[PDB]
């Protein structure tokens, strides 16, 4: 429209964070150093997928509130188009008004990424039945993203900040049931014009 809503999100990990590497070339090269490599950019910065955690958080909570939201996590689902998670995060004919950017670390993989030993202990002989290594973003790193809503509606900062508390309680990334991914978002918002670059 004649405005856009910019939400500048700032994540500070409070527990170790893991999001797995998605690149076949980067997974297969780090198969003899770590068995669980983290997701990293080619500029050595850690890349977490944000759009998908916000959508799932809002879909879970809005289903539990009694609203008309659909589920896009069931296999090969068709976004209906008349949800508020179908206007924000997109349908199959209309794109998402909210452009959610990846959470990219302010530091590099040599200051936040550490390689760790995880174990599987036998419940009778109390001994290390399995040993494996993984990478994990430390407890205190800082990630930054930016959500650009293209047609600002009223319930868009109130709906993103409601999915953010759900991600602060549940977690972002992987291994979330064993304690990984506990984060704390800080949000600064602003309403910009669409013609701020035209001079």
């Amino acid at each position: 429209a004649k405005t856009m809503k910019k939400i500048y999100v700032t994540m500070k990990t409070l527990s170790p964070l893991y999001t797995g590497e998605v690149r076949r070339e980067d997974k297969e090269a780090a198969q003899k150093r770590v068995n669980f490599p983290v997701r990293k950019t080619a500029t050595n910065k850690v890349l977490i997928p944000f759009k998908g955690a916000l959508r799932s958080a809002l879909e879970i909570m809005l289903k539990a509130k009694g609203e008309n939201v659909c589920d896009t996590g069931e296999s090969r689902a068709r976004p209906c188009g008349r949800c508020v998670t179908c206007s924000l995060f997109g349908s199959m004919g209309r794109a998402g008004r909210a452009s959610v950017d990846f959470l990219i670390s302010n530091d590099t993989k040599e200051q936040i990424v550490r390689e760790s030993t995880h174990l599987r202990i036998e419940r009778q002989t109390k001994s290390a039945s399995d040993t494996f290594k993984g990478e994990e973003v430390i407890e205190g790193a800082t990630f930054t993203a930016t959500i650009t809503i293209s047609n600002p509606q009223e319930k868009d900062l109130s709906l993103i900040q409601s999915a953010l508390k759900f991600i602060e309680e549940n977690g972002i990334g992987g291994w979330l049931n064993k304690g990984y991914g506990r984060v704390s978002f800080e949000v600064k918002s602003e309403d910009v014009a669409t013609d701020r670059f035209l001079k």
Binding site: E25, D26, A29, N44
Partner: protein
């Protein structure tokens, strides 16, 4: 066309750029130690090469690959698997040395990691078809994983030899494997047995009470001095004391199938080589008095873990310092070897261990080619040795282009079948034929069935069957021993070569002594320990028998289970 980028002294960089019209193929991207900015400008001159090939894992041939990854001039890095695993020690050690010597680092650790991101591996005698060429690797008897690259291009067949080994290598095969076809251009590298005497003088020193410090290179040399101290029935312990060399010793044992035929198919060094892991245990030996053999590795005595042992050996008179390899200039090893410094310990030298071949072995290498090569580009070595070997190669009636200075070979494709009766269907002058493609030297002939009627008229791995292999892969796929990740990885290693597949299944099936765990996937269902081991051995034998079968047959057997690999 071949370019020789720094092929005179190998310092300031080294490279062999074969420029096919569809492909810039690079071989031996290396540096010889003795500068950085000339190395950069040499890499800039190189241009975008589709592939850098590395014969061995010395920095002489593989020391400049991460710099080409930095400048993004290289797109694939093909080497042997042992060369990959050894270069993942050499490159990290080079960067460690570069930072610790406070000389602007030639590349970074990121560059090394990206180099192994674009690193494909293929073994010996496995032809890869890339960019209108055919690249086959052949063992050359140097350090482990070293090969003699055979690029077959339409302009000709080029055999880059690299460093050919000598007869005194006890862990590789002596006769260096060669292309069985027509080599047109031989890029040979010129050169630069009192082994048992080692035993004698070590038996001299231990019985006299002292120890023996044995300088060694970490790539190949320590692991052969260790084999010589292993087969000889000695009485005193031998102790390897080098983090990089103990790692390389473990890599030699891991890559056993890529070694001599006697040693492949029990510790290779027959244990008795008690390994010093922590540096506290190295200071213990430095302060010790038990007469023992120290096969350590600082190299040519310059920097490393010898440098602590060296002072204690130096002050002692009843010990010795057996130098083994070539001591170089501006290096401690020469100065203690030439007597610049006063040693109290005996300074012996055994010229037997020399990973580089001599003149006669290179002559035998040129002679055992099926067709005498049109040209022998001698490249590296001293100038004087190159003049001598060039004169003797001329005496054997072979052309020599020494690297200070042209028949148009063109493999043609003759048709040899009738082309009069053609038809047009979809605006294509087409004709159906049923015939035979024959691959002759300098000539690929398509030849009709009549040719085959005359041609015909004139004329270790276990062995299961197709049915038993199919049945056992099905059973071990339904109790979840053979998964789809396992079948895909087995297919990848089998594409990398049959000995790579043998190494993969041996690495999975190996029960670790301490834990008692094999890396197969445990069997789903009710089975006892003896039954579980009898299923794991079935997995071992069923997948080992598959390695004997041909590539397409393995693909057809392993596409009903993992339908993507």
């Amino acid at each position: 066309m071949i370019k020789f980028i720094g092929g005179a002294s190998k310092v300031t960089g080294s490279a062999f750029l074969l420029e096919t019209g569809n492909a810039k193929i690079l071989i031996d991207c290396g540096i010889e130690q003795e500068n950085n900015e000339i190395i950069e400008k040499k890499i800039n001159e190189i241009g975008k090469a589709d592939i850098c090939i590395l014969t061995h894992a010395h920095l002489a041939a593989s020391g400049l690959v991460p710099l080409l990854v930095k400048k993004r001039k290289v797109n694939k890095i093909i080497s042997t698997p042992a060369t990959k695993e050894l270069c993942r020690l050499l490159f990290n050690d080079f960067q460690r040395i570069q930072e610790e010597n406070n000389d602007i680092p030639l590349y970074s650790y990121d560059d090394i990691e990206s180099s192994f991101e674009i690193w494909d591996e293929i073994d010996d005698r496995n032809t890869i078809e890339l960019f209108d060429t055919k690249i086959t690797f052949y063992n050359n008897s140097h350090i482990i994983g070293s090969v003699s690259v055979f690029i077959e291009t339409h302009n000709g067949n080029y055999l880059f030899s690299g460093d050919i080994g000598s007869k005194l290598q006890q862990l590789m095969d002596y006769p260096p494997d060669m292309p069985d076809g027509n080599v047109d251009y031989l890029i040979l590298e010129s050169t630069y047995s009192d082994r048992d005497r080692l035993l004698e003088i070590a038996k001299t020193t231990c019985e006299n009470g002292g120890k023996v410090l044995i300088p060694s290179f970490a790539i190949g040399r320590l692991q052969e001095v260790l084999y010589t101290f292993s087969n000889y029935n000695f009485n005193f312990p031998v102790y390897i004391d080098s983090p990089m060399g103990s790692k390389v010793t473990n890599l030699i044992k891991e890559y056993n199938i890529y070694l001599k035929k006697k040693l492949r198919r029990d510790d290779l060094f027959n244990n008795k080589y008690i390994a010093i892991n922590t540096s506290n245990q190295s200071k213990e030996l430095s302060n010790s008095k038990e007469p023992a053999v120290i096969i350590s590795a600082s190299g040519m005595l310059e920097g490393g873990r010898i440098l602590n042992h060296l002072e204690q050996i130096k002050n002692d008179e009843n010990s010795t310092l057996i130098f083994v390899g070539y001591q170089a200039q501006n290096t401690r090893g020469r100065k203690i070897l030439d007597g610049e410094e006063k040693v109290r310990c005996r300074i012996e030298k055994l010229n037997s261990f020399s990973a580089h071949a001599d003149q006669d072995e290179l002559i035998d290498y040129i002679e055992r080619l099926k067709y005498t090569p049109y040209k022998v580009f001698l490249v590296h070595g001293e100038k004087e040795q190159r003049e001598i070997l060039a004169k003797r190669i001329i005496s054997k009636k072979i052309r020599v282009e020494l690297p200070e200075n042209e028949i148009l070979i063109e493999k043609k494709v003759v048709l040899n079948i009738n082309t009069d009766n053609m038809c047009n269907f979809a605006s294509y002058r087409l004709m159906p034929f049923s015939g035979f493609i024959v691959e002759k030297d300098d000539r690929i002939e398509i030849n009709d069935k009549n040719w085959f009627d005359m041609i015909w008229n004139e004329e270790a791995l276990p062995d299961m069957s197709h049915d038993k292999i199919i049945e056992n892969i099905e059973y071990l796929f339904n109790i979840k021993i053979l998964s789809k990740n396992r079948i895909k990885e087995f297919w990848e290693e089998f594409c990398k070569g049959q000995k790579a597949a043998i190494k993969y299944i041996t690495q999975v099936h190996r029960k670790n002594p301490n834990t008692g765990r094999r890396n197969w996937n445990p069997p789903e269902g009710d089975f006892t320990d003896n039954e579980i081991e009898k299923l794991y051995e079935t997995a071992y034998n069923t997948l080992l028998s598959l390695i004997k079968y041909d590539k397409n047959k393995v693909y057809n057997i392993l596409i009903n289970f993992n339908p993507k690999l």
